[PDB]
Amino acid sequence: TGYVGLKNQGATCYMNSLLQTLFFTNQLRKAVYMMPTEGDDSSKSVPLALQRVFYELQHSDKPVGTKKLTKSFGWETLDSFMQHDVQELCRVLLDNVENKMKGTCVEGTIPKLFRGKMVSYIQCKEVDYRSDRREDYYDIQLSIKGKKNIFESFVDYVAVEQLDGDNKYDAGEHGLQEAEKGVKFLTLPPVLHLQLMRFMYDPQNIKINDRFEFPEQLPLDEFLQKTDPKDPANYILHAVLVHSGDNGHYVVYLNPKGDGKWCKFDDDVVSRCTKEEAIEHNYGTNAYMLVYIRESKLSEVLQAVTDHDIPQQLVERLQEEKRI
Ligand SMILES: O=C([C@H]1CCN(Cc2ccccc2)C[C@@H]1c1ccccc1)N1CCC(O)(Cn2cnc3ccccc3c2=O)CC1
């Protein structure tokens, strides 16, 4: 394969799956490597530790470990990971990093890669008041239950809600009202993170192992409020985060370079796999998170990274950390 795996400290759950997804977002990786953490405390800097993992994943020939990272952002209590969603963890990481890039030549890489804009709206049926609020997003959560595939989930996401009695809308000057709330997409990011809502509550939270489908390629101009002839919103499955069981095991399937050559990443064991094993076979063992990249940004996002693309201070500081 060439590619190298992560150690198990146990209970990390989705952490190892997320870390590889980030590592193989090549334009992220370079920018992480270009952050200025010369004079930072090794043991409680998130950005520093993210560089270690990234650097090791690039070079190490043995299973890489993550012990110091877990330490840096302080999830050590017996429930930390069980009690959170992937989107949460991600946010913890890319947050710290967005903030470390401020000032530098790579400032605002994260928003450039993962951020898009949304339009929430409420419209009154017989009366004239509309409320429009714009919103940035860095990920989106999709409805599964009673949905066959992605396309319905989007259709559902943009479905117009109604506001009848018992749930009538307070318009202030015009009192209670029958109204329609919806959501609509202004723009979709180069790198599209989608979470599948599989963990839901009942007489007591539970996992829905129901069959959900996703394609290799995903056109979203349908859902754009206004399209563009030159950059249309088609997307290429890069990553597929998988859980199996209940109480189980968390694996990720990637095609790092983008070419449709797949690999199963199970902690320390990375092995080549079929496309069927990464897509259909995880329709429902099944997927909870999906990563798509936009065809027009594929080459930039997944730009190649040399061993020279790491700075020297960085490299040296790490070498010495290993020695002792
Ligand atoms: O890793 C988990 C697990 C938490 C822990 N449980 C049991 C468990 C496993 C391992 C050790 C101890 C106990 C199993 C969870 C699980 C559920 C379903 C699919 C896979 C794993 N999760 C939570 C769900 C997830 O965040 C996906 N997502 C995102 N956003 C949502 C927004 C709104 C509504 C639902 C969701 C939702 O389900 C993935 C990470």
Side-chain angles (χ1 to χ4, degrees), residues 11 13-14 81-87 141 195-200 205-208 242-244 246-248 250 286-289:
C13 292
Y14 38 95
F81 284 114
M82 174 177 88
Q83 281 307 121
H84 291 61
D85 303 280
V86 260
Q87 49 263 54
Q141 291 73 54
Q195 278 79 39
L196 306 193
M197 291 161 87
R198 289 193 116 119
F199 205 37
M200 297 262 49
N205 237 87
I206 31 93
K207 175 169 155 182
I208 297 78
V242 156
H243 179 265
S244 81
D246 38 42
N247 264 78
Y250 300 77
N286 54 233
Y288 59 106
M289 179 166 163

PDB file of all heavy atoms in Angstrom, residues 11 13-14 81-87 141 195-200 205-208 242-244 246-248 250 286-289, ligand 1:
ATOM      1  N   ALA A  11     -10.953   2.701  22.877  1.00  0.00           N
ATOM      2  CA  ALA A  11     -11.992   3.687  23.163  1.00  0.00           C
ATOM      3  C   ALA A  11     -11.861   4.956  22.312  1.00  0.00           C
ATOM      4  O   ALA A  11     -12.777   5.780  22.291  1.00  0.00           O
ATOM      5  CB  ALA A  11     -12.007   4.026  24.641  1.00  0.00           C
ATOM      6  N   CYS A  13     -12.386   5.098  19.513  1.00  0.00           N
ATOM      7  CA  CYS A  13     -13.588   4.966  18.708  1.00  0.00           C
ATOM      8  C   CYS A  13     -13.311   5.463  17.295  1.00  0.00           C
ATOM      9  O   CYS A  13     -12.583   4.814  16.552  1.00  0.00           O
ATOM     10  CB  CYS A  13     -14.766   5.692  19.353  1.00  0.00           C
ATOM     11  SG  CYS A  13     -15.306   4.919  20.896  1.00  0.00           S
ATOM     12  N   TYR A  14     -13.856   6.642  16.970  1.00  0.00           N
ATOM     13  CA  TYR A  14     -13.851   7.182  15.621  1.00  0.00           C
ATOM     14  C   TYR A  14     -12.590   7.995  15.383  1.00  0.00           C
ATOM     15  O   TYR A  14     -12.325   8.392  14.247  1.00  0.00           O
ATOM     16  CB  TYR A  14     -15.085   8.062  15.379  1.00  0.00           C
ATOM     17  CG  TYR A  14     -15.534   8.927  16.547  1.00  0.00           C
ATOM     18  CD1 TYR A  14     -15.120  10.240  16.649  1.00  0.00           C
ATOM     19  CD2 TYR A  14     -16.378   8.424  17.538  1.00  0.00           C
ATOM     20  CE1 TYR A  14     -15.532  11.046  17.699  1.00  0.00           C
ATOM     21  CE2 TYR A  14     -16.772   9.204  18.613  1.00  0.00           C
ATOM     22  CZ  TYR A  14     -16.341  10.523  18.694  1.00  0.00           C
ATOM     23  OH  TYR A  14     -16.708  11.358  19.713  1.00  0.00           O
ATOM     24  N   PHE A  81     -15.443   9.823  24.428  1.00  0.00           N
ATOM     25  CA  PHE A  81     -15.703   9.511  23.024  1.00  0.00           C
ATOM     26  C   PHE A  81     -17.113   8.956  22.768  1.00  0.00           C
ATOM     27  O   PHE A  81     -17.738   9.289  21.765  1.00  0.00           O
ATOM     28  CB  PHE A  81     -14.679   8.485  22.519  1.00  0.00           C
ATOM     29  CG  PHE A  81     -13.303   9.071  22.237  1.00  0.00           C
ATOM     30  CD1 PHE A  81     -12.193   8.695  22.994  1.00  0.00           C
ATOM     31  CD2 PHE A  81     -13.126   9.989  21.199  1.00  0.00           C
ATOM     32  CE1 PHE A  81     -10.943   9.242  22.729  1.00  0.00           C
ATOM     33  CE2 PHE A  81     -11.877  10.539  20.945  1.00  0.00           C
ATOM     34  CZ  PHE A  81     -10.789  10.164  21.706  1.00  0.00           C
ATOM     35  N   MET A  82     -17.586   8.050  23.628  1.00  0.00           N
ATOM     36  CA  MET A  82     -18.948   7.541  23.568  1.00  0.00           C
ATOM     37  C   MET A  82     -19.958   8.691  23.627  1.00  0.00           C
ATOM     38  O   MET A  82     -21.030   8.570  23.052  1.00  0.00           O
ATOM     39  CB  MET A  82     -19.156   6.562  24.733  1.00  0.00           C
ATOM     40  CG  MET A  82     -20.565   6.034  24.927  1.00  0.00           C
ATOM     41  SD  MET A  82     -20.625   4.823  26.266  1.00  0.00           S
ATOM     42  CE  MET A  82     -20.890   5.798  27.758  1.00  0.00           C
ATOM     43  N   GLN A  83     -19.601   9.804  24.298  1.00  0.00           N
ATOM     44  CA  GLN A  83     -20.505  10.902  24.629  1.00  0.00           C
ATOM     45  C   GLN A  83     -20.530  12.012  23.578  1.00  0.00           C
ATOM     46  O   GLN A  83     -21.211  13.017  23.781  1.00  0.00           O
ATOM     47  CB  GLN A  83     -20.081  11.584  25.938  1.00  0.00           C
ATOM     48  CG  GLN A  83     -20.490  10.836  27.203  1.00  0.00           C
ATOM     49  CD  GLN A  83     -21.968  10.509  27.242  1.00  0.00           C
ATOM     50  OE1 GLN A  83     -22.377   9.339  27.326  1.00  0.00           O
ATOM     51  NE2 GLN A  83     -22.781  11.556  27.169  1.00  0.00           N
ATOM     52  N   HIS A  84     -19.798  11.834  22.468  1.00  0.00           N
ATOM     53  CA  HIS A  84     -19.644  12.871  21.454  1.00  0.00           C
ATOM     54  C   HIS A  84     -19.888  12.308  20.047  1.00  0.00           C
ATOM     55  O   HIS A  84     -19.853  11.099  19.855  1.00  0.00           O
ATOM     56  CB  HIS A  84     -18.251  13.500  21.544  1.00  0.00           C
ATOM     57  CG  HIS A  84     -18.006  14.322  22.756  1.00  0.00           C
ATOM     58  ND1 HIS A  84     -18.056  13.810  24.028  1.00  0.00           N
ATOM     59  CD2 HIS A  84     -17.643  15.603  22.882  1.00  0.00           C
ATOM     60  CE1 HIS A  84     -17.755  14.772  24.889  1.00  0.00           C
ATOM     61  NE2 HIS A  84     -17.492  15.870  24.212  1.00  0.00           N
ATOM     62  N   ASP A  85     -20.155  13.207  19.080  1.00  0.00           N
ATOM     63  CA  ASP A  85     -20.256  12.884  17.660  1.00  0.00           C
ATOM     64  C   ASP A  85     -18.925  13.177  16.964  1.00  0.00           C
ATOM     65  O   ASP A  85     -18.204  14.071  17.400  1.00  0.00           O
ATOM     66  CB  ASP A  85     -21.364  13.706  17.014  1.00  0.00           C
ATOM     67  CG  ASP A  85     -22.748  13.549  17.632  1.00  0.00           C
ATOM     68  OD1 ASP A  85     -23.417  12.538  17.315  1.00  0.00           O
ATOM     69  OD2 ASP A  85     -23.137  14.429  18.440  1.00  0.00           O
ATOM     70  N   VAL A  86     -18.619  12.457  15.868  1.00  0.00           N
ATOM     71  CA  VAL A  86     -17.488  12.786  14.995  1.00  0.00           C
ATOM     72  C   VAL A  86     -17.417  14.295  14.740  1.00  0.00           C
ATOM     73  O   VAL A  86     -16.387  14.907  15.004  1.00  0.00           O
ATOM     74  CB  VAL A  86     -17.429  12.079  13.625  1.00  0.00           C
ATOM     75  CG1 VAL A  86     -16.460  10.904  13.633  1.00  0.00           C
ATOM     76  CG2 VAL A  86     -18.806  11.687  13.088  1.00  0.00           C
ATOM     77  N   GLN A  87     -18.494  14.901  14.232  1.00  0.00           N
ATOM     78  CA  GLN A  87     -18.449  16.316  13.889  1.00  0.00           C
ATOM     79  C   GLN A  87     -17.882  17.143  15.037  1.00  0.00           C
ATOM     80  O   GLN A  87     -17.311  18.210  14.797  1.00  0.00           O
ATOM     81  CB  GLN A  87     -19.784  16.974  13.534  1.00  0.00           C
ATOM     82  CG  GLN A  87     -20.915  16.700  14.513  1.00  0.00           C
ATOM     83  CD  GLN A  87     -21.776  15.561  14.034  1.00  0.00           C
ATOM     84  OE1 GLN A  87     -21.270  14.468  13.752  1.00  0.00           O
ATOM     85  NE2 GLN A  87     -23.066  15.815  13.877  1.00  0.00           N
ATOM     86  N   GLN A 141     -25.802  17.372   8.603  1.00  0.00           N
ATOM     87  CA  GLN A 141     -26.344  16.147   9.187  1.00  0.00           C
ATOM     88  C   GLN A 141     -27.605  15.702   8.428  1.00  0.00           C
ATOM     89  O   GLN A 141     -28.542  16.480   8.278  1.00  0.00           O
ATOM     90  CB  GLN A 141     -26.608  16.393  10.673  1.00  0.00           C
ATOM     91  CG  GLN A 141     -25.346  16.558  11.513  1.00  0.00           C
ATOM     92  CD  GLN A 141     -24.643  17.882  11.307  1.00  0.00           C
ATOM     93  OE1 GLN A 141     -25.244  18.946  11.446  1.00  0.00           O
ATOM     94  NE2 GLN A 141     -23.352  17.839  10.989  1.00  0.00           N
ATOM     95  N   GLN A 195     -22.621  13.886   7.889  1.00  0.00           N
ATOM     96  CA  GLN A 195     -22.910  12.895   8.921  1.00  0.00           C
ATOM     97  C   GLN A 195     -24.300  12.297   8.712  1.00  0.00           C
ATOM     98  O   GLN A 195     -25.264  13.009   8.434  1.00  0.00           O
ATOM     99  CB  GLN A 195     -22.813  13.467  10.337  1.00  0.00           C
ATOM    100  CG  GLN A 195     -21.388  13.520  10.877  1.00  0.00           C
ATOM    101  CD  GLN A 195     -20.577  14.681  10.343  1.00  0.00           C
ATOM    102  OE1 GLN A 195     -21.080  15.798  10.178  1.00  0.00           O
ATOM    103  NE2 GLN A 195     -19.298  14.431  10.098  1.00  0.00           N
ATOM    104  N   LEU A 196     -24.387  10.974   8.878  1.00  0.00           N
ATOM    105  CA  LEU A 196     -25.645  10.247   8.786  1.00  0.00           C
ATOM    106  C   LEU A 196     -26.248  10.049  10.179  1.00  0.00           C
ATOM    107  O   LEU A 196     -25.597   9.476  11.055  1.00  0.00           O
ATOM    108  CB  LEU A 196     -25.360   8.916   8.096  1.00  0.00           C
ATOM    109  CG  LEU A 196     -24.642   9.019   6.749  1.00  0.00           C
ATOM    110  CD1 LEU A 196     -24.643   7.729   5.960  1.00  0.00           C
ATOM    111  CD2 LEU A 196     -25.254  10.110   5.924  1.00  0.00           C
ATOM    112  N   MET A 197     -27.490  10.519  10.368  1.00  0.00           N
ATOM    113  CA  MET A 197     -28.140  10.464  11.673  1.00  0.00           C
ATOM    114  C   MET A 197     -28.632   9.043  11.968  1.00  0.00           C
ATOM    115  O   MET A 197     -29.796   8.714  11.728  1.00  0.00           O
ATOM    116  CB  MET A 197     -29.286  11.476  11.759  1.00  0.00           C
ATOM    117  CG  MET A 197     -28.789  12.895  11.771  1.00  0.00           C
ATOM    118  SD  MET A 197     -30.057  14.090  11.319  1.00  0.00           S
ATOM    119  CE  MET A 197     -30.786  14.372  12.940  1.00  0.00           C
ATOM    120  N   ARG A 198     -27.722   8.221  12.515  1.00  0.00           N
ATOM    121  CA  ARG A 198     -27.990   6.827  12.805  1.00  0.00           C
ATOM    122  C   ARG A 198     -28.149   6.604  14.300  1.00  0.00           C
ATOM    123  O   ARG A 198     -28.583   5.534  14.697  1.00  0.00           O
ATOM    124  CB  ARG A 198     -26.892   5.879  12.305  1.00  0.00           C
ATOM    125  CG  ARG A 198     -26.850   5.747  10.787  1.00  0.00           C
ATOM    126  CD  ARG A 198     -25.991   4.610  10.271  1.00  0.00           C
ATOM    127  NE  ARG A 198     -26.835   3.638   9.569  1.00  0.00           N
ATOM    128  CZ  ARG A 198     -26.723   3.294   8.291  1.00  0.00           C
ATOM    129  NH1 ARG A 198     -25.782   3.820   7.531  1.00  0.00           N
ATOM    130  NH2 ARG A 198     -27.559   2.418   7.767  1.00  0.00           N
ATOM    131  N   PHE A 199     -27.778   7.583  15.125  1.00  0.00           N
ATOM    132  CA  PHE A 199     -27.902   7.440  16.566  1.00  0.00           C
ATOM    133  C   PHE A 199     -29.060   8.316  17.033  1.00  0.00           C
ATOM    134  O   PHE A 199     -28.963   9.541  17.033  1.00  0.00           O
ATOM    135  CB  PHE A 199     -26.552   7.758  17.213  1.00  0.00           C
ATOM    136  CG  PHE A 199     -26.317   7.106  18.570  1.00  0.00           C
ATOM    137  CD1 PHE A 199     -26.774   5.812  18.839  1.00  0.00           C
ATOM    138  CD2 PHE A 199     -25.636   7.781  19.580  1.00  0.00           C
ATOM    139  CE1 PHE A 199     -26.555   5.218  20.076  1.00  0.00           C
ATOM    140  CE2 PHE A 199     -25.419   7.181  20.811  1.00  0.00           C
ATOM    141  CZ  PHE A 199     -25.882   5.904  21.059  1.00  0.00           C
ATOM    142  N   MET A 200     -30.168   7.674  17.411  1.00  0.00           N
ATOM    143  CA  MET A 200     -31.393   8.383  17.741  1.00  0.00           C
ATOM    144  C   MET A 200     -31.996   7.754  18.989  1.00  0.00           C
ATOM    145  O   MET A 200     -31.620   6.634  19.318  1.00  0.00           O
ATOM    146  CB  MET A 200     -32.371   8.318  16.562  1.00  0.00           C
ATOM    147  CG  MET A 200     -31.868   8.997  15.287  1.00  0.00           C
ATOM    148  SD  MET A 200     -32.509  10.668  15.046  1.00  0.00           S
ATOM    149  CE  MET A 200     -32.223  11.473  16.632  1.00  0.00           C
ATOM    150  N   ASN A 205     -31.090   6.228  23.493  1.00  0.00           N
ATOM    151  CA  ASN A 205     -30.467   6.459  22.161  1.00  0.00           C
ATOM    152  C   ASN A 205     -30.073   5.105  21.567  1.00  0.00           C
ATOM    153  O   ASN A 205     -29.630   4.233  22.302  1.00  0.00           O
ATOM    154  CB  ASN A 205     -29.286   7.423  22.260  1.00  0.00           C
ATOM    155  CG  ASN A 205     -29.471   8.627  21.364  1.00  0.00           C
ATOM    156  OD1 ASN A 205     -30.093   9.611  21.777  1.00  0.00           O
ATOM    157  ND2 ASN A 205     -28.925   8.583  20.155  1.00  0.00           N
ATOM    158  N   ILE A 206     -30.215   4.933  20.242  1.00  0.00           N
ATOM    159  CA  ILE A 206     -30.003   3.645  19.582  1.00  0.00           C
ATOM    160  C   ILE A 206     -29.523   3.849  18.144  1.00  0.00           C
ATOM    161  O   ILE A 206     -29.797   4.881  17.549  1.00  0.00           O
ATOM    162  CB  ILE A 206     -31.282   2.782  19.608  1.00  0.00           C
ATOM    163  CG1 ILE A 206     -32.575   3.623  19.578  1.00  0.00           C
ATOM    164  CG2 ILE A 206     -31.281   1.823  20.799  1.00  0.00           C
ATOM    165  CD1 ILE A 206     -33.154   3.864  18.194  1.00  0.00           C
ATOM    166  N   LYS A 207     -28.847   2.835  17.590  1.00  0.00           N
ATOM    167  CA  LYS A 207     -28.322   2.855  16.231  1.00  0.00           C
ATOM    168  C   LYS A 207     -29.296   2.196  15.245  1.00  0.00           C
ATOM    169  O   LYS A 207     -29.657   1.038  15.419  1.00  0.00           O
ATOM    170  CB  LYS A 207     -26.972   2.123  16.135  1.00  0.00           C
ATOM    171  CG  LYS A 207     -26.452   2.015  14.688  1.00  0.00           C
ATOM    172  CD  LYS A 207     -25.022   1.543  14.440  1.00  0.00           C
ATOM    173  CE  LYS A 207     -24.875   0.930  13.077  1.00  0.00           C
ATOM    174  NZ  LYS A 207     -23.518   0.428  12.826  1.00  0.00           N
ATOM    175  N   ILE A 208     -29.630   2.893  14.148  1.00  0.00           N
ATOM    176  CA  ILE A 208     -30.520   2.356  13.128  1.00  0.00           C
ATOM    177  C   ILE A 208     -29.695   1.681  12.026  1.00  0.00           C
ATOM    178  O   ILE A 208     -29.094   2.352  11.188  1.00  0.00           O
ATOM    179  CB  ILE A 208     -31.418   3.471  12.555  1.00  0.00           C
ATOM    180  CG1 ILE A 208     -32.335   4.071  13.612  1.00  0.00           C
ATOM    181  CG2 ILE A 208     -32.220   2.974  11.355  1.00  0.00           C
ATOM    182  CD1 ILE A 208     -31.653   5.046  14.543  1.00  0.00           C
ATOM    183  N   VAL A 242     -16.985   3.919   8.846  1.00  0.00           N
ATOM    184  CA  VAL A 242     -17.852   2.779   9.076  1.00  0.00           C
ATOM    185  C   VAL A 242     -17.807   2.332  10.527  1.00  0.00           C
ATOM    186  O   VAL A 242     -16.733   2.159  11.081  1.00  0.00           O
ATOM    187  CB  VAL A 242     -17.386   1.652   8.142  1.00  0.00           C
ATOM    188  CG1 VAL A 242     -17.780   0.286   8.675  1.00  0.00           C
ATOM    189  CG2 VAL A 242     -17.915   1.871   6.735  1.00  0.00           C
ATOM    190  N   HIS A 243     -18.984   2.071  11.092  1.00  0.00           N
ATOM    191  CA  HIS A 243     -19.126   1.368  12.362  1.00  0.00           C
ATOM    192  C   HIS A 243     -19.932   0.084  12.170  1.00  0.00           C
ATOM    193  O   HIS A 243     -20.873   0.036  11.370  1.00  0.00           O
ATOM    194  CB  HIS A 243     -19.828   2.255  13.402  1.00  0.00           C
ATOM    195  CG  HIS A 243     -20.047   1.614  14.732  1.00  0.00           C
ATOM    196  ND1 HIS A 243     -21.232   0.998  15.062  1.00  0.00           N
ATOM    197  CD2 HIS A 243     -19.262   1.499  15.811  1.00  0.00           C
ATOM    198  CE1 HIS A 243     -21.163   0.537  16.303  1.00  0.00           C
ATOM    199  NE2 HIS A 243     -19.972   0.827  16.777  1.00  0.00           N
ATOM    200  N   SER A 244     -19.586  -0.934  12.962  1.00  0.00           N
ATOM    201  CA  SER A 244     -20.310  -2.200  12.974  1.00  0.00           C
ATOM    202  C   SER A 244     -20.554  -2.609  14.423  1.00  0.00           C
ATOM    203  O   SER A 244     -19.603  -2.645  15.192  1.00  0.00           O
ATOM    204  CB  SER A 244     -19.551  -3.285  12.249  1.00  0.00           C
ATOM    205  OG  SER A 244     -18.551  -3.834  13.098  1.00  0.00           O
ATOM    206  N   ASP A 246     -22.792  -2.405  18.194  1.00  0.00           N
ATOM    207  CA  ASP A 246     -23.666  -1.692  19.119  1.00  0.00           C
ATOM    208  C   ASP A 246     -22.961  -1.516  20.466  1.00  0.00           C
ATOM    209  O   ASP A 246     -21.891  -0.931  20.516  1.00  0.00           O
ATOM    210  CB  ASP A 246     -24.996  -2.414  19.274  1.00  0.00           C
ATOM    211  CG  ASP A 246     -24.895  -3.936  19.296  1.00  0.00           C
ATOM    212  OD1 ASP A 246     -23.965  -4.464  19.947  1.00  0.00           O
ATOM    213  OD2 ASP A 246     -25.734  -4.590  18.642  1.00  0.00           O
ATOM    214  N   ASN A 247     -23.558  -2.051  21.546  1.00  0.00           N
ATOM    215  CA  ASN A 247     -23.035  -1.949  22.904  1.00  0.00           C
ATOM    216  C   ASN A 247     -23.167  -0.503  23.395  1.00  0.00           C
ATOM    217  O   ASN A 247     -24.315  -0.013  23.381  1.00  0.00           O
ATOM    218  CB  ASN A 247     -21.603  -2.462  23.051  1.00  0.00           C
ATOM    219  CG  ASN A 247     -21.533  -3.889  23.538  1.00  0.00           C
ATOM    220  OD1 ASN A 247     -21.749  -4.828  22.766  1.00  0.00           O
ATOM    221  ND2 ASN A 247     -21.195  -4.071  24.803  1.00  0.00           N
ATOM    222  N   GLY A 248     -18.303  -1.320  19.076  1.00  0.00           N
ATOM    223  CA  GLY A 248     -18.022  -2.489  18.236  1.00  0.00           C
ATOM    224  C   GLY A 248     -16.653  -2.324  17.589  1.00  0.00           C
ATOM    225  O   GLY A 248     -15.634  -2.540  18.244  1.00  0.00           O
ATOM    226  N   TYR A 250     -14.610   0.389  14.531  1.00  0.00           N
ATOM    227  CA  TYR A 250     -14.659   1.535  13.628  1.00  0.00           C
ATOM    228  C   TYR A 250     -13.527   1.519  12.591  1.00  0.00           C
ATOM    229  O   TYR A 250     -12.348   1.659  12.905  1.00  0.00           O
ATOM    230  CB  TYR A 250     -14.552   2.835  14.419  1.00  0.00           C
ATOM    231  CG  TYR A 250     -15.602   3.148  15.474  1.00  0.00           C
ATOM    232  CD1 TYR A 250     -15.589   2.524  16.724  1.00  0.00           C
ATOM    233  CD2 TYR A 250     -16.539   4.149  15.263  1.00  0.00           C
ATOM    234  CE1 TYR A 250     -16.504   2.854  17.712  1.00  0.00           C
ATOM    235  CE2 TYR A 250     -17.450   4.497  16.248  1.00  0.00           C
ATOM    236  CZ  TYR A 250     -17.439   3.850  17.474  1.00  0.00           C
ATOM    237  OH  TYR A 250     -18.335   4.223  18.436  1.00  0.00           O
ATOM    238  N   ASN A 286     -21.932  -0.610   8.384  1.00  0.00           N
ATOM    239  CA  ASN A 286     -22.499   0.490   7.619  1.00  0.00           C
ATOM    240  C   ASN A 286     -21.798   1.808   7.954  1.00  0.00           C
ATOM    241  O   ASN A 286     -21.044   1.916   8.921  1.00  0.00           O
ATOM    242  CB  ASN A 286     -23.996   0.597   7.882  1.00  0.00           C
ATOM    243  CG  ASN A 286     -24.303   0.688   9.359  1.00  0.00           C
ATOM    244  OD1 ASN A 286     -25.113  -0.094   9.876  1.00  0.00           O
ATOM    245  ND2 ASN A 286     -23.673   1.632  10.053  1.00  0.00           N
ATOM    246  N   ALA A 287     -22.117   2.839   7.169  1.00  0.00           N
ATOM    247  CA  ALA A 287     -21.426   4.116   7.242  1.00  0.00           C
ATOM    248  C   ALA A 287     -22.190   5.115   8.123  1.00  0.00           C
ATOM    249  O   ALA A 287     -23.420   5.091   8.154  1.00  0.00           O
ATOM    250  CB  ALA A 287     -21.227   4.621   5.830  1.00  0.00           C
ATOM    251  N   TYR A 288     -21.443   5.983   8.838  1.00  0.00           N
ATOM    252  CA  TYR A 288     -21.999   7.064   9.658  1.00  0.00           C
ATOM    253  C   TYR A 288     -21.510   8.434   9.152  1.00  0.00           C
ATOM    254  O   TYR A 288     -22.140   9.471   9.375  1.00  0.00           O
ATOM    255  CB  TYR A 288     -21.652   6.871  11.141  1.00  0.00           C
ATOM    256  CG  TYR A 288     -20.170   6.824  11.490  1.00  0.00           C
ATOM    257  CD1 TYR A 288     -19.542   7.894  12.116  1.00  0.00           C
ATOM    258  CD2 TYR A 288     -19.391   5.714  11.208  1.00  0.00           C
ATOM    259  CE1 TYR A 288     -18.189   7.875  12.436  1.00  0.00           C
ATOM    260  CE2 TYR A 288     -18.037   5.688  11.496  1.00  0.00           C
ATOM    261  CZ  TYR A 288     -17.429   6.775  12.111  1.00  0.00           C
ATOM    262  OH  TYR A 288     -16.098   6.753  12.427  1.00  0.00           O
ATOM    263  N   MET A 289     -20.370   8.460   8.466  1.00  0.00           N
ATOM    264  CA  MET A 289     -19.886   9.709   7.916  1.00  0.00           C
ATOM    265  C   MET A 289     -19.359   9.453   6.505  1.00  0.00           C
ATOM    266  O   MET A 289     -18.806   8.373   6.224  1.00  0.00           O
ATOM    267  CB  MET A 289     -18.802  10.305   8.826  1.00  0.00           C
ATOM    268  CG  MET A 289     -18.212  11.601   8.316  1.00  0.00           C
ATOM    269  SD  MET A 289     -17.264  12.418   9.607  1.00  0.00           S
ATOM    270  CE  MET A 289     -16.314  13.555   8.590  1.00  0.00           C
TER     271      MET A 289
HETATM  272  O1  LIG B   1     -19.162   6.840  17.611  1.00  0.00           O
HETATM  273  C1  LIG B   1     -20.368   7.037  17.807  1.00  0.00           C
HETATM  274  C2  LIG B   1     -21.056   6.023  18.705  1.00  0.00           C
HETATM  275  C3  LIG B   1     -21.325   6.581  20.109  1.00  0.00           C
HETATM  276  C4  LIG B   1     -21.366   5.328  20.974  1.00  0.00           C
HETATM  277  N1  LIG B   1     -22.360   4.316  20.553  1.00  0.00           N
HETATM  278  C5  LIG B   1     -22.145   3.069  21.300  1.00  0.00           C
HETATM  279  C6  LIG B   1     -20.713   2.854  21.735  1.00  0.00           C
HETATM  280  C7  LIG B   1     -19.713   2.569  20.803  1.00  0.00           C
HETATM  281  C8  LIG B   1     -18.398   2.399  21.213  1.00  0.00           C
HETATM  282  C9  LIG B   1     -18.061   2.510  22.551  1.00  0.00           C
HETATM  283  C10 LIG B   1     -19.039   2.771  23.484  1.00  0.00           C
HETATM  284  C11 LIG B   1     -20.358   2.956  23.081  1.00  0.00           C
HETATM  285  C12 LIG B   1     -22.399   4.041  19.106  1.00  0.00           C
HETATM  286  C13 LIG B   1     -22.372   5.335  18.294  1.00  0.00           C
HETATM  287  C14 LIG B   1     -22.648   5.173  16.811  1.00  0.00           C
HETATM  288  C15 LIG B   1     -23.935   5.398  16.364  1.00  0.00           C
HETATM  289  C16 LIG B   1     -24.248   5.304  15.019  1.00  0.00           C
HETATM  290  C17 LIG B   1     -23.285   4.971  14.109  1.00  0.00           C
HETATM  291  C18 LIG B   1     -22.009   4.721  14.534  1.00  0.00           C
HETATM  292  C19 LIG B   1     -21.688   4.828  15.879  1.00  0.00           C
HETATM  293  N2  LIG B   1     -20.933   8.103  17.225  1.00  0.00           N
HETATM  294  C20 LIG B   1     -22.237   8.719  17.516  1.00  0.00           C
HETATM  295  C21 LIG B   1     -23.057   8.856  16.254  1.00  0.00           C
HETATM  296  C22 LIG B   1     -22.295   9.600  15.160  1.00  0.00           C
HETATM  297  O2  LIG B   1     -21.893  10.863  15.688  1.00  0.00           O
HETATM  298  C23 LIG B   1     -23.092   9.879  13.862  1.00  0.00           C
HETATM  299  N3  LIG B   1     -24.073  10.956  14.078  1.00  0.00           N
HETATM  300  C24 LIG B   1     -23.675  12.257  13.946  1.00  0.00           C
HETATM  301  N4  LIG B   1     -24.424  13.291  14.123  1.00  0.00           N
HETATM  302  C25 LIG B   1     -25.745  13.066  14.495  1.00  0.00           C
HETATM  303  C26 LIG B   1     -26.582  14.165  14.701  1.00  0.00           C
HETATM  304  C27 LIG B   1     -27.878  13.978  15.088  1.00  0.00           C
HETATM  305  C28 LIG B   1     -28.389  12.684  15.264  1.00  0.00           C
HETATM  306  C29 LIG B   1     -27.589  11.592  15.041  1.00  0.00           C
HETATM  307  C30 LIG B   1     -26.259  11.779  14.663  1.00  0.00           C
HETATM  308  C31 LIG B   1     -25.381  10.641  14.441  1.00  0.00           C
HETATM  309  O3  LIG B   1     -25.726   9.478  14.574  1.00  0.00           O
HETATM  310  C32 LIG B   1     -20.976   8.879  14.914  1.00  0.00           C
HETATM  311  C33 LIG B   1     -20.165   8.794  16.172  1.00  0.00           C
END
